[model samples]
Target: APLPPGWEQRVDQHGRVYYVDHVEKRTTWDRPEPLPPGWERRVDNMGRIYYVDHFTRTTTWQRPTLESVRNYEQWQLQRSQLQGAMQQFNQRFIYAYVRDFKAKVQYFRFWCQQLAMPQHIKITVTRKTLFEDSFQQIMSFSPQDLRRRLWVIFPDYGGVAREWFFLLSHEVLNPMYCLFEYADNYCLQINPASYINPDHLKYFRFIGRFIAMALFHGKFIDTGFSLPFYKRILNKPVGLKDLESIDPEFYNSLIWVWRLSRGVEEQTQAFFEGFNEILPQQYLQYFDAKELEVLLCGMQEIDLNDWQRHAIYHYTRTQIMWFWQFVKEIDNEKRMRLLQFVTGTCRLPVGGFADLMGSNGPQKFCIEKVGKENWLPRSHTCFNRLDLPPYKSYEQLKEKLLFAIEETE
Candidate 1:
């Protein structure tokens, strides 16, 4: 395009003047048009416009689309709501509700002793410090060396502190079998320390005490309604809401208990069929064929008398039929979830399997009932405080608990 002699001008074909050069003989191209109201322009190396905040120099694709803006605002609102919910959960449930629940547990323990229930094994309330010290040492080894010195407790996913607590608590209760087999080589340090939830500490405390009670009083009997059965109870529409309403930690712990219980049941069934060939050679040494046969075949290992034998046999078979009916209702995913929980810690329950044989009596009602009620504490018939009359002392509560257990038989 030509320009006027002293006043050089460049005009576009569409008739807009873009530039003028008179002295330097150079002309600029089209000047940028003004942006719309409240709109600005920007670019990145990729040749795309990215809106930038003028004051902060932060970039975005543009002002968000209406839907995206709505979504972001919704997410922020929910985040604030979640924070409030968590705070409420800690203040109301964790501190006070669980403390009251623990008091009931203490009362149960005191009454179990008072009611002349033979403490089959001494229930040690204190944590084992030396075992913790030694376990830490075991974990320091290389993976290969770790494999040699320590075995993963099986029928356990070994993810959280509570899983380890149950795995070790059972082993701790039975010193003889554990000493002969594990010999301080068991890998209790399965989950990383960082993963241990302080919020779950009370749940762990309650679980440890519950395991102790099962070992001491119930002697670990299979009431046909084991973990799987109890899970069915929890899956009921009201049960989920009840536990979830208390706290997520409690609900999660209950789910973990059922998963572990179901794993224990499956492994127990497998071992009785002489299917523990997959366990370590050291594990196999703890169980001879006759012992396996004894556990698999008869009521002798539990050492039940004629009356106790008759009662449990019928009860167990009845529960077995009930379990089969329950199984029909479950999907494969639920079945597989239990199997997944058992993957790494498959062999740990063998000692418990041995515990099932003639080692105890008709503690089934107590163990099974407590287990069921523990997960369903809101149910008026279980450990619900609402159903219980006011007690002057734990002694009265103990009598009441004893009476409750008695009335069940």
Candidate 2:
């Protein structure tokens, strides 16, 4: 009501209000008067709800502005939706390669006709197993061997890629996204032969470059499963016997991919720094690209680090609080999109979400395919390798890796 003793309410030049010289009794370096112009306004449950002011009209009730979100419920939902969308988007790419499978064949034929070196490649889009997934085939590329292949990886390449490309682009294009979580996946980048028409290739190549660079050079790493946490919870001994039996290479592969991703991230950072240094308004174009470059640019402009420090810096309790606080603020549309992507698309006909994607307990499978050999490649399947001890610490893993590198040399 009345100004309390020693307290003076001051309205800023901009008409913002705050009590000054109260308890400790003094002014703070002139905080903005009205929560800065164009801030979103929101209404929460009321007791502890936060709000923003956009000046025109307030945003519906919202949470506090959070920076450096990691492992938030919102992030997970976003990742799943993005994956589903990319899957849908890639289908168009598939059809472009095979509107009439033969038409596609002829399209490349037209290109081979113009080739100075007379190069040849294949293009196909038949449904393939998301299982037995080999090399990072999502990008437009020639496959593993020099039969120099050109094929869209998904059965519905255009559809899936289109759907998820934005999300994938969102994450890969924005390293800031990875500040939330890292998973077990590794992406490899491969060079594609020039497209039939160089101009047409630009669009395809851009997508290819994005995915390849994401898997290869894009600067985000996800190590989804945590072996150490699993072992500790399950009470398994951790040691080299575990490392040998376990796929140490799997972790290494993830690291290698992230290293490459980091390279792309750095290049993108430089690009942005150069641009924003000149045309600062161009920085606002970020949401459109949503790539790592854009995110890095935003972070540098804002003068901040990626979410990497969020978990490390805060007290564990504070970190958890901050994460939930940010996550619950996500919009319903984004939340639903995430649920559909993870639950709907990632589902296998027989197995539920767990059987294929995350961790689903036990499932019955057709016994017709019994073999001593592992079903997937070294990186694909998770061995009961849990029976073995795991590397006890980062030091141990590093020691082993350095030894391996030296011995290989």
Candidate 3:
């Protein structure tokens, strides 16, 4: 839109605007973006508009727009442009499906983790009191904090950080703790009747963060959740403003109901927020009650012994969409490991794939044809070479690849 007289406009490189006014010695600009500070917008008794500029003790019938207004305008426009940017990038991130209930949860969960980098602060703990010593600090973090890279000291020192977060996974939700209770055999539900403890709100909060952290950390809780078991874990009806002898504030503090209300809301806030931070809330739409538990909760890594066990579990049924399916499906770290596994470098070359170098020199990545059908794709990373058997199917390729990569790093 053309400006009123004496007004001019421009911006650059997705930077701020150059909406400038040359008159008034390039001063006194009113962009309709806003009125500046100390710039009174009072009206005469007749309601005719007037402007006051406190900086120079000047007043005017006309308006003077501050730079911040322009900045605000700049922010608004960029927000629109940002929408455009995400609109464009959406193509690269895409997917679906679920199988065996477990691996299905892993796929969508993996993509979510790759997309969102939740804060993962590393904290160490001792073996003897790992659960007790660790969770004190664990729940102490804001519920949304995820991927706490735990360093477990098995013998008063440190063990691998990755293995211990799940170490406390089962205990946090263990019904033995009364955080949850068994409705029947095998399935655990939130102990809705758990007001016996005054800190139930915090306990409930601890449950979700504890639950969500597993997803962020690529592990699963040992919860034997049942059909419809979690619908009431999400069983939102248990709310504040209701009557329950459940730890009356007068048990006996005057700051009762509202404090309970605040705590309860914050606890709920903690769950969704813990989840909202762990995975995008988009799953709220794609997944329902049962699926959210498995899907958002997440599973584990590719393991040789575990893979054999898993293979035997699914041995009766086999699918060929394996390695290619397997490779891309592995989360970022494993992908990087696979990259270093085959190409000797996890990062792309500065000049792109064409710039990739190998023992032989700029090899640009080659998959030479060779290997037994039973073998995993072998890498001569020196040449950035991955030689593979023309497997009977993709599953065969992945079975070999996933198992082989598992043993190395």
Candidate 4:
């Protein structure tokens, strides 16, 4: 395989060959290269070549050839020709002869092409002006640059981005902002009345980009939209039956667009087109609407018992038990804040709290014994660890707990 720009061939101390990809912290015995379109190149132990379909994620021994496409320019063409060729190839055909015993060699890939094509990116957004500042800067991003490596800066560390994601996502989803409205199901839909602002379409575009950024960066959006919205994005069919889940009276009633003289049908279509550009709905149907919801918003229900089971304890006794009691007893709003305070996210993973993520993937939620009994609680969001001070009673714990979470960054 010809070495791609970011990949290199190297020999170990044993003088055995291996390949590494600098852009993604990847190493493997089999040769690899930057894939063409959605197709990936790979080699078998015997050094024979194979291709992997980008969408199907299956391999083929032959590089797909289309004599029809060969009649036209392969490198560049009008979008219609390319789309037609793509449709034909995908719909008509689908593999490899190479066999390998060593194909099981483990490799690490810290980079995701979906995150950034050129390089990793770091961004700084202040909490003080989170809505306008981040909103404007992110909205101004080039369509290409929108997918660049994304990291949040200031008080720098892995935890900051997650917190930034949570804060900004919440603000972006807040109803008062008027970009989106809540259905009775608590799912989000575009606010038809927002067209009054005249600048609303751009905001819708920003929201689409923002949502894509949240997914690409591996951060939860802090909220979710109606199931039908996900279905629309996935290019799946939506019908009247879906309405009962969101608006009961509206299953009796109906629904996009902001205010204005020009009309918003095109505005809504533009919003979807913007969204499609970034997060392209093509392969998104790999996961259905419900799973897509899980991907975007994390898990919906906050299972208290499930939460208790996943918490690894350094010590649990009077204060620790009381801590759980206090949490369960709190108002829904406070409980949510406490979750965000301790975990840097209000939503749980699809696997529930058991799958809570840290800078390192799958770091379980931890309650480490620390500080004196009189101390207020503190959190190390990086490890999804909550540092708890063993309080003498539930009353004192609740008071301090409320105070600590109420302290904003």
What C-alpha lDDT values do all the predictions have? 0.29, 0.29, 0.46, 0.58
lDDT of 3 by residue, 1-409 (tens): 4554445776656765666654333533345354556565445666455555576344444455553234334433433443333322222211212223345455656765665544456455664455555667666665444543433454421224434543454345432233444321222345544454445565565556666665555544434443233443444333331111123233225435233333235445545654555543555443434344434333223333322232211112243235446655677445545654555433342234554554333655555557578666676554555665667766566667765544332
Model 1 TM-score relative to the real fold: 0.18
Worst 10 contiguous positions by lDDT, candidate 3: 90-99
Candidate 2 TM-score to native: 0.19
Error of 3 at 249 (Å): 34
Model 4, 1-409: lDDT tens digits are 4776568999999988999977557899988634455566666676555555566354444444353123222212322332233322122200011211112111101222533578556566776567667767776677677677666675344457666666666566533334555442133467666654445677677777777666565555545455566776777766654554444455445542112112346556766766766766674554545445545654333678888888887685436778788778865545556776666555444456876665445678788778897788887554567888877777888878777776522
Model 1 Cα shift for residue 232 (angstroms): 14
Q: Model 2: residues >4 Å from true position, as ranges? A: 1-46, 52-82, 85-225, 232-409
Give the Å error, residue 170, model 2. Answer: 13
lDDT of 1 by residue, 97-165 (tens): 111223433454454345432212111222333233323432333222321211233222222222233
Cα distance off (Å), candidate 3, residue 339: 36
The TM-score obtained by model 4 is: 0.44
Backbone clashes per model, in order?
A: 12, 61, 5, 8
Comparing candidate 2 with candidate 4, which one achieves the higher TM-score?
Answer: 4
Candidate 3 vs 4: which has more lDDT = 4
- Candidate 3 has an lDDT of 0.46
